[PDB]
Amino acid sequence: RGEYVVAKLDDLVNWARRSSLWPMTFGLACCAVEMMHMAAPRYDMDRFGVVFRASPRQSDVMIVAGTLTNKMAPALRKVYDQMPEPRYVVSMGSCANGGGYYHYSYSVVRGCDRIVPVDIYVPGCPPTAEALLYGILQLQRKIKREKRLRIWYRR
Amino acid sequence: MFMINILSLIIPILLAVAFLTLVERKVLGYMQLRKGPNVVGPYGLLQPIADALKLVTKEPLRPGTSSISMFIIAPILGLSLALTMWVPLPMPYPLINMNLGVLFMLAMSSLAVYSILWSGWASNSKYALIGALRAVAQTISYEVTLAIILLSVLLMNGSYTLSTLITTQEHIWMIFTSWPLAMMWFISTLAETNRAPFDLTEGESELVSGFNVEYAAGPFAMFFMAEYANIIMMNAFTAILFLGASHDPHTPELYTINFVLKTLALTITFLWIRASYPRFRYDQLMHLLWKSFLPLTLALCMWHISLPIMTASIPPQS
Amino acid sequence: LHHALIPHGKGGRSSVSGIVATVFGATGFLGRYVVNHLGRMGSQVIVPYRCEPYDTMHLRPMGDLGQIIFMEWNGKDKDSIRKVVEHSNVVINLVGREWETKNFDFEDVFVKIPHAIAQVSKEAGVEKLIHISHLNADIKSPSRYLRSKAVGEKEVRAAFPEATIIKPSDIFGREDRFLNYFASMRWFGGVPLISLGKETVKQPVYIVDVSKGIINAIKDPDAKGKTFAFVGPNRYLLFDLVQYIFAVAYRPFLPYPLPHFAYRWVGRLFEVSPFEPWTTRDKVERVHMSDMTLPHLPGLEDLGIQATPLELKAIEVLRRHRTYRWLTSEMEDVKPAKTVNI
Amino acid sequence: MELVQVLRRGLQQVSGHGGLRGYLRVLFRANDVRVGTLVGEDKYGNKYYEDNKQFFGRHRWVIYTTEMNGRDTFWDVDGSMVPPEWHRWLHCMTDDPPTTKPPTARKYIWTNHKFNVSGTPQQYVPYSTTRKKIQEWVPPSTPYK
Amino acid sequence: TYKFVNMREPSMDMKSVTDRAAQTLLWTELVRGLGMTLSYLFREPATINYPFEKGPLSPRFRGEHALRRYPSGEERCIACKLCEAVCPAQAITIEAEPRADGSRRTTRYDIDMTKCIYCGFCQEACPVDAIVEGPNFEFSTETHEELLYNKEKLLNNGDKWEAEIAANIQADYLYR
Amino acid sequence: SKVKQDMPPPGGYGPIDYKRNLPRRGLSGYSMFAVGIGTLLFGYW
Numbered sequence A: 001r002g003e004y005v006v007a008k009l010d011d012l013v014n015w016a017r018r019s020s021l022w023p024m025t026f027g028l029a030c031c032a033v034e035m036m037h038m039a040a041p042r043y044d045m046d047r048f049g050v051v052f053r054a055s056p057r058q059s060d061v062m063i064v065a066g067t068l069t070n071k072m073a074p075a076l077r078k079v080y081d082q083m084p085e086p087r088y089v090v091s092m093g094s095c096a097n098g099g100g101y102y103h104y105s106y107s108v109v110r111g112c113d114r115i116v117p118v119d120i121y122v123p124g125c126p127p128t129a130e131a132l133l134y135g136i137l138q139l140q141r142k143i144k145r146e147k148r149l150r151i152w153y154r155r
Numbered sequence B: 001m002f003m004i005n006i007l008s009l010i011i012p013i014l015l016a017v018a019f020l021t022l023v024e025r026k027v028l029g030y031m032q033l034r035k036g037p038n039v040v041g042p043y044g045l046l047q048p049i050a051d052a053l054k055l056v057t058k059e060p061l062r063p064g065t066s067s068i069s070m071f072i073i074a075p076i077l078g079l080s081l082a083l084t085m086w087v088p089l090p091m092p093y094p095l096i097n098m099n100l101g102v103l104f105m106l107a108m109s110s111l112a113v114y115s116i117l118w119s120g121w122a123s124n125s126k127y128a129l130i131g132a133l134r135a136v137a138q139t140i141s142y143e144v145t146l147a148i149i150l151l152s153v154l155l156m157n158g159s160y161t162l163s164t165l166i167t168t169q170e171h172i173w174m175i176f177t178s179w180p181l182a183m184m185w186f187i188s189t190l191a192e193t194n195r196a197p198f199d200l201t202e203g204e205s206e207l208v209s210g211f212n213v214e215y216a217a218g219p220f221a222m223f224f225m226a227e228y229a230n231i232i233m234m235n236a237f238t239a240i241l242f243l244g245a246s247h248d249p250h251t252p253e254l255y256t257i258n259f260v261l262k263t264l265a266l267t268i269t270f271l272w273i274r275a276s277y278p279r280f281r282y283d284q285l286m287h288l289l290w291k292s293f294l295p296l297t298l299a300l301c302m303w304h305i306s307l308p309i310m311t312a313s314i315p316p317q318s
Numbered sequence C: 001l002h003h004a005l006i007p008h009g010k011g012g013r014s015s016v017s018g019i020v021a022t023v024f025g026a027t028g029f030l031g032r033y034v035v036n037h038l039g040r041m042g043s044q045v046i047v048p049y050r051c052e053p054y055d056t057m058h059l060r061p062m063g064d065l066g067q068i069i070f071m072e073w074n075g076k077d078k079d080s081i082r083k084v085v086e087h088s089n090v091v092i093n094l095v096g097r098e099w100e101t102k103n104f105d106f107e108d109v110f111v112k113i114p115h116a117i118a119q120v121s122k123e124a125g126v127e128k129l130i131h132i133s134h135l136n137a138d139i140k141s142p143s144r145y146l147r148s149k150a151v152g153e154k155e156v157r158a159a160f161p162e163a164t165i166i167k168p169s170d171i172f173g174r175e176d177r178f179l180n181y182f183a184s185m186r187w188f189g190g191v192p193l194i195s196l197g198k199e200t201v202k203q204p205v206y207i208v209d210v211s212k213g214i215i216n217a218i219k220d221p222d223a224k225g226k227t228f229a230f231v232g233p234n235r236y237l238l239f240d241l242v243q244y245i246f247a248v249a250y251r252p253f254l255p256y257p258l259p260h261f262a263y264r265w266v267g268r269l270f271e272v273s274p275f276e277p278w279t280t281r282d283k284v285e286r287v288h289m290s291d292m293t294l295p296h297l298p299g300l301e302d303l304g305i306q307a308t309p310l311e312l313k314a315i316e317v318l319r320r321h322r323t324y325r326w327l328t329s330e331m332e333d334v335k336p337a338k339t340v341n342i
Numbered sequence D: 001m002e003l004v005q006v007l008r009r010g011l012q013q014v015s016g017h018g019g020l021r022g023y024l025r026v027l028f029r030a031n032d033v034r035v036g037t038l039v040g041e042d043k044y045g046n047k048y049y050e051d052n053k054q055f056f057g058r059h060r061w062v063i064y065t066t067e068m069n070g071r072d073t074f075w076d077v078d079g080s081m082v083p084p085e086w087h088r089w090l091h092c093m094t095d096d097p098p099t100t101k102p103p104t105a106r107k108y109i110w111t112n113h114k115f116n117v118s119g120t121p122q123q124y125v126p127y128s129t130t131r132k133k134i135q136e137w138v139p140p141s142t143p144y145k
Numbered sequence E: 001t002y003k004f005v006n007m008r009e010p011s012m013d014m015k016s017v018t019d020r021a022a023q024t025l026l027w028t029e030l031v032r033g034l035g036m037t038l039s040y041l042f043r044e045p046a047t048i049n050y051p052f053e054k055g056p057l058s059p060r061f062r063g064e065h066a067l068r069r070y071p072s073g074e075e076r077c078i079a080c081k082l083c084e085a086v087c088p089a090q091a092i093t094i095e096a097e098p099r100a101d102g103s104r105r106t107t108r109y110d111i112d113m114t115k116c117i118y119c120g121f122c123q124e125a126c127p128v129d130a131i132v133e134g135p136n137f138e139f140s141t142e143t144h145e146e147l148l149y150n151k152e153k154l155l156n157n158g159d160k161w162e163a164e165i166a167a168n169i170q171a172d173y174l175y176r
Numbered sequence F: 001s002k003v004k005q006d007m008p009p010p011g012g013y014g015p016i017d018y019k020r021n022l023p024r025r026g027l028s029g030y031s032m033f034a035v036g037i038g039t040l041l042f043g044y045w
């Protein structure tokens, strides 16, 4: 039946997307250091299929790791625009989540969500590299639960 | 079944290129105390298929300032030439037994730079144009020594046909006769394939992604196809030239196994050097050759010009 | 008003406005824009959706955290509509489709679904329901879209007597399928106007104008029961409109008269596609109807919003379509297309 | 000599994991084939192994349960599937497993360790936990006027 | 005391210069560089098998905030507002009101995880060990609002991680 | 009882190496050149 065929196509495409999540080298602050430590041998992003890649044209997930300030927010929004779809935003740290320590400052965006649609909120100051890996795996399951071709079949 | 042979020289080559990415991300990662891709199935044997699927279903955006026509013709040029330059290789019996295989492969290798050229210029970017010019300089500098070293090495072959190399290295590897040139040749194979430590056309640290910066999804995967097919073909050519192997006319499978093993070892050394060095700085990789490689290779060219004559060892042309 | 619906703040993101609303079909064109305005003033939006949640991602960053809430709903399921409209002051109906899918015809998305929305909204106890139709809505129009829209308007009026009915003429914007349609028609050779397109008069209205009109109608205490007609300020001849569209895009213009039945065949051929149907018979028809002037119906100016002429807000839509050659030319380079006087 | 023993213990790898079928089960699920002493098991089904010979970091590990709280976890697993009592032992925060040293029991402690409830309709929605501050006048009902 | 890190003049004996020329022509330190990476590939990788293998922690680890309670069942919190008065990020909001029994307890105790800096200052300031930073750190959420913790959510965390938190405090209270 | 805190062992910790230990290895330049030239001569013959 057509539903089974589109189901299997959904599983294949979602598996590819979740098993080759290519992130972006967009570290901003101390939350980037853990972003490096999970790339360090101990946790090693590489075994999970995730390999760092600059040039947003060839990346899927943006881990906004660090404080997002007013002077940088236009750059972050523009760079998010460069990403071809599908795209995902993982927010690392309290600063990139809702403001963190400098939530009441004059030149800090009170949450990265106000600029891009954040897909996964990873809490911490900074989050432990295990916690960030957990957030990435949660995003992976999110991609696994996508129903693109199913919705197309029931257009 | 000539079509059968042509398809058998394309699909296996593409599969080998796909698994080259996995073996690179594993060998490199094990250099760096990591484990490399491990999750997808057993030992990551599905990563090439996974990212292959992603890159051909991810949205292939076209920049608003691009030049559409060349932006599209460049990936086709790159992949077509990378695949075509596999046909004259004397894997037991070459598919296309050309009388001038070396010159043909030199011509197509020189053409392959034009893919980089047109892709960089048509993308309308500062980084892309920078990378295109670095490619210009790198490939011209290294092409001069490529041609001279090929002449010097093949002076003992007697002609430019690739198959006779097997006859030439019947009793001894050619590397024992031209080990200096071989070193230089290896370095040239590192640079013409635009790999480390000469991978300045991409320059991930300083040029973000170089000439692939505006290349996304399918065209990017295709330029990667061209690059890795060129890597494997260059290592195969180096194995054919210097590290010859025994060839039983009745069982070509023995020569197939030996040749494949030598190509694998040479490629593994490519990934080895990729994960053990800093990166060159533009002019240095030029000043390395125009001031250290070119004079030495000229002297070795004169030496190998004279050598058959002084020892009465001029190889036959037929 | 309830103790939590009393307006508070200064109109910013984190300000209680009291416009708790449900916008059916928010995932598309004006559905996005309206939400933005609803998000800007600080109103809790109960945006329902049937598509993949990823497609609702651009819906996320226009409201203060906790304001925008997404829910799954199905058109042929009264329980879903009841769940989404149970706690809401206003229910804005923006459900529509320029084509007829296999599981949803024009009547389903313009009569049946609006009927269910209006009936369930009346049962729940909402105070305002803004239904959206087309200006050229007629029970005898050849295109099934406008005919279905007319019967849907009558049904919605019957079910919700005080429902505000807004009849926009033609929305042009960054994603409009009206200016981008003409711009994208460059691929298929020339632009094939029917009878050279010298008999059709179109009155396009800016998207921001329509969304602001919806917001004002919600805020206006007299929009109940009324039937507004949202139209642009000028009336363009169709040939002159395409002339302006291709001049602002600086693409070559190749007009080509085309017999009506041949264009119907072309529309069928494009309808065959099992994906986004670039052109339908309804589509090629509608571009040939003139915009029926309805002076009796109240307009945007009554709501207090001045229509923005297409010339000022045409560079936004067509700057993407220009090649690298005329990608930076200013807005005043191309002279306004001559307009037949209203 | 060590080559032969090395080839041999690769067969103890398949023998320990209940034969070939269990060998591919653990290989495809937990991506490892290494064996270890069964330190314990929790009420949810996760099996808890330890091997002190492994270097610090992989001396203890989990094979997650196939099913927990009405959710198939044969293929998808996460770090929140660890019950609180054993999370101490797993993360090398103590050398006392719950089997030997069981945590103190109290009435308010849960009896079913819910995993990360994000995504599922059992999410957490923030709301004000305080009552009203200003009351209303509640006008009288008699028309009077 | 200071040392000259790069003050070595190379010897100019014929042997020394021959060795330098050999290293230049026949790349020698380059071969050493290759050998080092060969030696480490043959070495054991350091990657752990997350989530089946977890990196080591300590009982002092700061993670998800949680409200504890006495063994009897009564909450430890008494709304003294020391934690709210000491939080560097002002992430705690407390509203207190005398309960029906008479004990002073928070009618609202909200901690904003999106604004918290996980310093642990609250757990030091608390005179009754009511608020603690739990051992949990894998509590990422798909939406922002789920990170705005209420009193009920914090009490649920306290009731869920109580087995771990009691042991962690038991193994660390003597240091404090 | 007595005070207990983290302390070095009674005899103190062992020595800690800090100096550079880059080992010296490989043949002399004369030997390397001789091996290269001999290989060239054998290949030539």
Ligand SMILES: COC1=C(OC)C(=O)C(C/C=C(\C)CC/C=C(\C)CC/C=C(\C)CC/C=C(\C)CC/C=C(/C)CC/C=C(/C)CC/C=C(\C)CC/C=C(\C)CC/C=C(\C)CCC=C(C)C)=C(C)C1=O
Residues within 6 Å of the ligand: A025, A026, A027, A028, A029, A030, A032, A035, A036, A039, A045, A046, A051, A052, B011, B014, B015, B017, B018, B019, B021, B024, B025, B028, B029, B047, B048, B049, B051, B052, B055, B221, B224
């Ligand atoms: C001082 O303060 C600082 C900060 O302070 C705040 C900062 O923030 C930052 C900034 C922060 C960062 C940079 C973050 C930290 C980043 C890092 C540490 C980087 C870590 C990187 C890694 C762990 C990964 C490195 C990558 C490696 C080792 C290898 C990568 C190589 C690859 C090959 C990857 C794979 C990619 C690709 C494209 C290959 C896949 C493609 C295929 C297999 C295609 C196959 C296709 C087929 C088979 C097709 C087959 C077709 C067939 C058969 C037929 C077809 C024909 C038809 C007709 C259809 C810095 C730097 C900083 O310094």
Ligand SMILES: NC(=O)C1=CN([C@@H]2O[C@H](COP(=O)(O)OP(=O)(O)OC[C@H]3O[C@@H](n4cnc5c(N)ncnc54)[C@H](OP(=O)(O)O)[C@@H]3O)[C@@H](O)[C@H]2O)C=CC1
Residues within 6 Å of the ligand: C024, C025, C026, C027, C028, C029, C030, C031, C050, C051, C074, C075, C093, C094, C095, C096, C097, C098, C104, C109, C132, C133, C134, C135, C167, C168, C169, C170, C171, C172, C176, C178
């Ligand atoms: N020029 C114009 O376009 C004019 C339009 N209008 C009316 O405005 C409304 C919105 O227009 P616009 O935003 O441009 O349209 P779009 O096609 O861009 O968006 C239509 C919306 O309706 C939803 N929808 C359609 N069919 C169904 C269904 N069967 N069940 C559930 N949801 C459904 C879509 O969901 P999804 O995104 O998942 O498909 C989407 O949210 C329509 O009623 C239209 O007729 C009025 C005057 C002029």
Ligand code: SF4
Residues within 6 Å of the ligand: A029, A030, A031, A065, A066, A067, A092, A093, A094, A095, A096, A100, A101, A124, A125, A126, A127, E117
């Ligand atoms: S959340 Fe904490 S660790 Fe992350 S950037 Fe902000 S202050 Fe630094």
Ligand code: SF4
Residues within 6 Å of the ligand: E065, E083, E086, E087, E088, E089, E091, E092, E111, E115, E116, E117, E118, E119, E120, E121, E122, E123, E133
């Ligand atoms: S640990 Fe968290 S809640 Fe406690 S004071 Fe620090 S930031 Fe505030």
Ligand code: SF4
Residues within 6 Å of the ligand: E076, E077, E078, E079, E080, E081, E082, E083, E084, E094, E122, E125, E126, E127, E128, E129, E130, E131
């Ligand atoms: S410091 Fe402790 S007792 Fe005081 S208000 Fe905070 S949680 Fe309650």
